[PDB]
């Protein structure tokens, strides 16, 4: 109600270990309270002392502007000296001090923060749903990327990004600096290396903690590379856009084999994950809350909301994952083995031509093992129909 | 950035453009001379990709007008379309020319009109730092667009090759040949110019769109006016994830890239099935996204013709299939595992394919953004049947010898008449040999 | 609040301190300047204290405003302190203004004493930009040979880089700082909160100015430049022959030498945060 | 004070000066024989710095308005504002001169009533204690107004040559040419003493002007009295940071003198957006500071002839971009940085050019209290334009055998004509030397 933390010598089974930090100690927690009853008198009453700060006209439980905080007075009259102690009497209760309650705190941060708003808004930023407005920024950030991270770079990376979204019109000009890309360190290159922050506000920070804002970053590095081998394979395709482009060399239409094999293969491979990662995320986000009054339900729906894309997009631990980004990376040599002038027709042009059809080779059958575990009877099923869905359609 | 100048010309190029941004107006929710709303920023989140990015408060077209006919831009300039457009800038209004009904008479004005008709869609692009490309908006048609246009297929593809060059190409109207008889001509030398010096054509028949417009609107004859109708709405509904930005192919160099595998084979068939205004009663109560895109693989939603017989014969290589609006955005991956599974077109088996959906919002006018719409671009190896049927066409007026020397007194005088039947022939052996 | 803004009126005479010692007034400060500067340009003693006490009387009833008209009577600001040096340093003007109590507890002496230092700064770049305003409009200072367009075309680069930077630079940094304080007032409980947001606003306005009470680049980056309008002016004030026109764009050409090697020392002091200096950056970009 | 004393002059001359202070008088809200309201003091904090300073709680304007014709003078004692001048220290009441059409009637008329126009000027600045100038507010058309301007750009250049001298000519419509026949000469007769008889001048033009007042006035058919209206506010305009507070350039000769790098180059072309009465309804939704110095960087408000051609083979140099009113003084530096990407300013190919942003406040007033206000006064190095045509039409005139002795009747009497022709040509070939 308060939301006091009391304490003399300390013996709650809360404690303190924004809205700061709170905690169970589950030894000095009895053993006749379960522990999933422990985090119902733990989650409401943090959320009351966060109010208790700021202040007592938005607070969670309502105690000036409604009269519930009396019908909790007459609950602990009850409940203060019943002789043979019970389980179910306990968490009864527990019920209506949390139901009734959890939705006054949810028509607070509707029309206190945007709740419809934020939420598709800092994904259009991660999962990126400005597409267009952002191929901008890949284009100033290739001549740029170039290079490992180093200390300039941090304001160069920044000022970059600035002027890019800015000569385009974004439309809104405050909304540009809320953000700001964070790319010493030498990991390979500088690509598939660089962040992005994002702000947060209040009551918001419950369901944006600085521990999930890494959740949705680590997402994006795989997300930002099938946009960037994706652009490439644009680029390198408008190197042979003609006839006079169109050498009559069979070195050209081994190449010309490649490219109808490669720019097709993103345009499904990475188009079908990608898609699918934003399309039904989004979708379950938007029928809970338009529905759903309750804020732990949606709370908990939204940490199933981004484990389920950093495992989508991170297909399975090791074995996938390194089979699907050394397909881009393998691609992304196939564009060096465009961008030659003149070149089948060339000595270089047919060297090193010879390696990548090997590296090629090295994919496709690193993929073909992934698919004999796919057979094999339920090792993840979305991510065997997913897999052998784009693979079908690399063939019908 | 990717800021398309748009190269309307001749006689009905200008028409079919001209309703193209009478549209986006519509969808940008604004009058044609200012801002009038608030709900243009945030249902549309980027109106400007053809568009003059603002700074007046209006966003102003990047177009040419240009036409042998000074009338079809007089009949824009006492229409209310004309602060949409500039009459000193973007149409030059009392272009001259003759009436046109030649293929050298356009050939050779831009023969000494050669340096003012490449600094007026240079000074269209100068709010870009980086240019997507030229769209060719004209026509095969008459022999004013068609004259003329295969002059700048040349001379913008020595200059920029690099960038998009594609054209909207609009056969001749075959059940005229009384009014233009210079027509198997005409489109053959500009049909020439579009398989070495041009990277895409987007083949539209006009004949095969009255044949739809008896079945699906019921008009009881379909007059050039209600035909430009048809073409301005396919248009606008091929650019859904340029203009309202994707996250996929939000280039238009993007999608052209999978649905082109080699030069000279690169046609595109288009197809559009929300022509039947008895798909929105019924899309008003939800049609399924399980039947709205087996329609884009039904022989009847093309606007072009095809063989059918050669359906069999033949396999398709590259399919797009946007469906629009209401989707229902989770058994759209349901839906397409069920398109190979009947078998509804052959694909090719050898190698590489793709059967691609994709899916858009569309306009905050709820009452064009209620109901299905299915766009197919389609590439089907078949094609060689429409430069069979030109061909056809072609030399049985060089049996009754016309244009032998009727044709080779204006920028002519050699004979490369045995060299258009030759490349069209190269042409659809080579389109031939590529699958197996 | 009552009786600080009626009783006695506080933010009227936060506002008047503004007027005579941010330059945030009119032609007031101005007509008293050309006078005084048009006797440095003859190199003729302006210091003579006398005439400079008129000077201000004579500022303070330019415009007519009626909150300085009325505060050279009683309250005066006449009495202006100088600092002569026989060190041999340049002239300081020392303005100081006696403010009614319990307002004199707000405003103390450390206040006025880095409002000292700030209009110090102002108008030794008004010496400089308007060196090389009136020059312009003088319409030569000497008005081979025939090297006059070939020096035009590096005067105009230093005249309008001078004046650029405090043309655009100070409109900003006596704005921004102004508005947010202003502000500050509106929201005003109670004098201990009006005494925190005025000390906020000196240390705004430091980090404003020129940044830091050490060493910076940025007054590496004032004082280099007004080594070379000193050298520039003080040979322009004098009749020049055939020959001597060639000693000016030779020095000018290495006068552009030395301007741009602060300005890529002043991007090293732009990527270590983020600063008024992004736009100073900036301001050397659109000169 | 910085006072300047206007010498109005002219049949047109004094017509664009006497709006431009009955505007001072709205603005003020003033009536023009008494102080009756306290805006004053609260709208303007200072009121004569161009008047003559309060001894009966009013304030007299510093001009003087001496014509050859009387008629245009007296056309102001049938309005209530020959009480607001007065009838000897303005403007003589009955002050003749010639027919007068001649241009060599007027400069004769200078040295014969030269003892009394040293003395009305001197007359009207028994309170000027530290002079700005005097700036002629004399036309061209009409011989009138050119023939005694012409003489006191001279005598005021020999007393107070470091003072400013700069003049608001315009040049008449040079589209009639049979309803005036003297315009080459009398414009060259001027032309001539801009250069060495004077520092800067603000040029403007009359068939450039007419442009504007159909495009953002709407008028029906350009006709003179419209025209003033356009001109007398641009005029009030310029003198807003002299009439208000500011710092930076306070005075009307700090902003004229950052606009000159060299001689020959100072002619200033002027521009004002706000002449459009629908953009007090775009204000309840903001207009922005972001765009309103991207219509003044367009040519669009371009008040002096020239190409679009040869803004490609030439660059502005200097231009200053002065917002009043609203502007919103933390964005302003926002409005600065988009300049650049775009690119509608150019810069000079040897250095940097320079963009001076100015912003002052102002009195109650409907253009700045409501709705944006941009003054352009702008310095391209296309002003060669107006002079070769002038020069065209010089020469031609002379292969026409006109005014070589129909006009050396009167003080002409040794070769003066190719003294003009020549020093054109100076000013012509000097921009180009010092532009690329």
Known sequence: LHGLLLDQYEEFFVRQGSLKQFSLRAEMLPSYIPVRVAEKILFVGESVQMFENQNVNMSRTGSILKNQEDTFAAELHRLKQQPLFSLVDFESVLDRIRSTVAEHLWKLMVEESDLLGQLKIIKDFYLLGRGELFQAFIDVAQNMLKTPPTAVTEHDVNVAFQLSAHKVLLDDDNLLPLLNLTIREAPTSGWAALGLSYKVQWPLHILFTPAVLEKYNVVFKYLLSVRRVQSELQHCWALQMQRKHLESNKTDAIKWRLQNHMAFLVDNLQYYLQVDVLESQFSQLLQQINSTRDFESIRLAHDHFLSNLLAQSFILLKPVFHCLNEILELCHSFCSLVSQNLGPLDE????????????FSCQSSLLFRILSSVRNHQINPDLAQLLLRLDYNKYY | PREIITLQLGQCGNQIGFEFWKQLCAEHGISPEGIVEEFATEGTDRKDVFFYQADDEHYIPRAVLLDLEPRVIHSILNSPYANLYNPENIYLSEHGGGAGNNWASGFSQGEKIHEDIFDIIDREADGSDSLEGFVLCHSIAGGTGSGLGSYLLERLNDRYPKKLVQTYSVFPNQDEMSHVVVQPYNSLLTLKRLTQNADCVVVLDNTALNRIATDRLHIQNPSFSQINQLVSTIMSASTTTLRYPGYMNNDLIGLIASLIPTPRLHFLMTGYT???????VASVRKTTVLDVMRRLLQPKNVMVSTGRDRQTNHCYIAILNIIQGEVDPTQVHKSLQRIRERK????????????????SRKSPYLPSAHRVSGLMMA??????????????????????????????????????????????????????EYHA | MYTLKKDYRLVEYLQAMRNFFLLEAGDTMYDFYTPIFDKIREKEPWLNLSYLNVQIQEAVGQRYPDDSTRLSVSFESVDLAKKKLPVHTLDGLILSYKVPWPVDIVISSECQKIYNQVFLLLLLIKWAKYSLDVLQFNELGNAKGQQIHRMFLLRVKLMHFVNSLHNYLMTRILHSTGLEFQHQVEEAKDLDQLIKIHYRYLSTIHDRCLLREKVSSVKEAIMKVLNVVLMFADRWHAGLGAWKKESIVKMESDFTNCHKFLVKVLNKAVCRGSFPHLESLALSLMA
Request: charged share 30%; with cysteine.
């Open chain 1, 348 to 359: 270089r042009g047919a060297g090193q031509l010879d390696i990548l059809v090997k590296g």
């Open chain 2, 274 to 280: 929300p022509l039947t205004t008895d798909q929105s």
């Open chain 2, 379 to 432: 590439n089907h190896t078949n094609i060689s049947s429409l430069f069979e049927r030109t061909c056809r066409q072609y030399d049985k007026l060089r049996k009754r010898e016309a244009f032998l020397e009727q044709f080779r007194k204006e920028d002519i005088f050699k004979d490369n008449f045995d060299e258009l039947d030759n490349s069209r022939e190269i042409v659809q052996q080579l389109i031939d």
């Open chain 2, 344 to 359: 509804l077109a052959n694909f090719i088996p050898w190698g590489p394919a793709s059967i691609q959906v994709a899916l």
